[PDB]
Structure 1
Amino acid sequence: VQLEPNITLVLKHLASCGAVVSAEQQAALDHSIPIKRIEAGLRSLTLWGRLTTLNGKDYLVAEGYNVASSKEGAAVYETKYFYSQDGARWSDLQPVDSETATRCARIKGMLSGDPAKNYELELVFQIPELAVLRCRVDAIATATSVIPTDSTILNAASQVVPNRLFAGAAYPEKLESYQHRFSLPGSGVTLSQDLRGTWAVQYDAFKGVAQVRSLLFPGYFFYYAANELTWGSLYVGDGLRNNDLIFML
């Protein structure tokens, strides 16, 4: 039904789960989001999430893309990520190479405020904080990107496009009604094929709103209102991973 999740609806439905933004930052978001969508070539830019930090200047992260094709049996989005301490001015997040991608997963802890911070590892390796910031966003999006099933379909030239005739998913409480965004529409891969205890779903049968929370990544929330057929997701908190999931459950 919808073609792009809203910023007001996501911030409204996820307010209960603590996924909220500063009131001043909310006002700046309404103005500077369309500006960044035109300065860059992106045609669909939304707010991916907000990562906390040792200071009060949380990293507001926005994700946008132009083309979304299907190659090697997996739908790939040429996503572009932007970061901003406040909602006024956005900067860009460059991708990182494989050698740094392995040396950034060992830096556990909480990110600092100034994006010009360098961490040290072992000879000494100097890694910028923005590289660490990009790694955590990529790791979270790899395992948590959740969209309703059959919401995207394949057309000619192998492009995944929104299903304009989507009629919603029956039994929204079941995990089989949601799939990863990079899963091909034909493939029957859903959140059920993941680890059994990773995802928990709380569905309000009366108001027709469902909430999906990741236990592997506790800061990720996704909602899906069946009545109005709107879905959106956001991430709050740090981007660390819950390694010892077996003990928690």
Structure 2
Amino acid sequence: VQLEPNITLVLKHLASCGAVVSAEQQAALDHSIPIKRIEAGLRSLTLWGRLTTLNGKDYLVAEGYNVASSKEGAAVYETKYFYSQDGARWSDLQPVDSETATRCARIKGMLSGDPAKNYELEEKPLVFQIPELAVLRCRVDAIATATSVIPTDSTILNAASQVVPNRLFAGAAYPEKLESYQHRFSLPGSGVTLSQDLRGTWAVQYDAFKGVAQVRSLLFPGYFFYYAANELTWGSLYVGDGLRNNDLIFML
């Protein structure tokens, strides 16, 4: 049972799904992730995804946290996000207010690739200027609250009521069924899995000979998750512009 997703295995298994990174960025990540993880005091830090931009400088986004705790029936991870445009130097991706969350939710299209740009919105005519990093952080928040996939019963609650890896996890009995996976923020033993999601928003392809399942999000096309059952590893990645697929009812 893994303790943390491995970026090498993620990039190896999800390359068929087109979720790839540049070679220079791959090396740069191999160096930069440990540095930032140590100098931020975090226990976990991984590559969350890669958002494409109009000028060719895609945003790499990394997500880290220290400990996850059960609060109000949800497994809350106090996560912290960082962004980068070369894979070597990570900057903070600061949270956004709730009022601005709606405005950035109204902004669509592929991001510009210039962290200093700000878009404009008009309301009753009061104009707001929303920084691009705000739009980025909210798209990341939406995609994160939508997917955040882990296997079912891979976590467990400890005496201090904290969510820790279940080191005696044996694996998913039926890896080709959506019941084997769940959201990260669902408490262990709560029985809520991906099958409770809106029917038709997930696809699962399972290679029963090699034992590798791929779970693709259809609501957010670009989110891929993999689960290897013979080695008991798993991990996910987002690659794409970050916009939700609203025409899903017409495409199924």
TM range (shorter): over 0.9
Q: Which residue of 1 aligns with 2:61?
A: 61
Deviation at 1:156, TM superposition (A): 1.0
In structure 1, the residue corresponding to 2:79 is in which secondary structure? strand
Cα deviation, residue 43, structure 1: 1.0
- Measured in 1, the distance between the counterparts of 2:203 and 2:25 equals 30
Structure 1, residues 95-122: CA drift from partner, whole Å, max 9, x if none?
Answer: 001000111100011101111110100x
Give the equivalent residue in structure 2 for 1:232. Answer: 235
Q: Distance in 2 between matches of 1:80 and 1:18?
A: 26
Q: Which residue of 1 aligns with 2:164?
A: 161
Give the distance between the partners of 1:99 and 1:67, measured in 2 at CA: 28
Aligned to 2:127: 124
Q: For 2:43 and 2:249, locate their aligned partners in 1 and report how far apart those are by CA, in whole Å.
A: 41
1:139 is displaced (CA, Å) by 0.1
Query: Which of 187, 193, 207 is equivalent to 2:196?
Result: 193
1:46-72 deviations in Å (ceiling 9; x for gaps):
000001010111000000001210000
Q: Could you tell me which residue of structure 2 aligns to residue 70 of structure 1? A: 70
SS of aligned partner of 1:124: strand
1:33-53 Cα offsets, whole Å, 9 max, x none, are 100011101111000000101
Equivalent of 2:215, from 207, 212, 224?
Answer: 212
Q: What are the Cα deviations for residues 4-38 of structure 1, in whole angstroms up to 9, with x where unaligned? A: 00010000000100111000110111111100011
Q: What is the CA-CA distance between 1:186 and the residue it aligns to?
A: 1.6
Distance 2:215 2:175 in 1: 10
Supply the distance in 1 between the matched residues of 2:243 and 2:27 (Cα, whole angstroms). 29
Distance in 2 between residues matched to 1:29 and 1:82, nearest whole Å: 13
Give the Cα–Cα distance (whole angstroms) in 2 for the partners of residues 15 and 193 of structure 1: 28
Mapped to 1, the partners of 2:88 and 2:185 lie a distance apart of 31
CA distance in 1, matches of 2:75, 2:112: 34
| Distance in 2 between residues matched to 1:158 and 1:238, nearest whole Å | 37
Partner-residue secondary structure (3-state), 2:8: helix
Q: Report the 3-state secondary structure (helix = DSSP H, G, I; strand = E; otherwise coil) of the residue aligned with 2:106.
A: coil
Q: Which residue of 2 is the match for residue 151 of structure 1?
A: 154
CA RMSD of aligned residues (A): 0.5
Distance 1:93 1:83 in 2: 6
Percent of matched pairs sharing the same residue: 100
**Partner SS for 2:66:** strand
CA distance in 1 between partners of 2:248 and 2:39 (Å): 42
Q: CA deviation at 1:229?
A: 0.3
* Aligned mates of 2:152, 2:16 — CA distance in 1: 25
5+ residue gaps, structure 2, are: none
Mapped partners of 2:202, 2:188: distance in 1? 21
Q: How does 1:67-146 map to 2 (within 5 A)?
A: 67-121=67-121, 123-146=126-149
Structure 1: which 5+ residue stretches go unaligned?
Answer: none
Shift of 1:224: 0.1
Within the candidate set 171, 176, 184, 1:173 is matched to 176
Q: How many Å separate the matches in 2 of 1:173 and 1:238?
A: 28
- Where do 4+ consecutive residues of structure 1 move more than 4 Å? none
In structure 1, distance between residues paired with 2:173 and 2:52 = 36
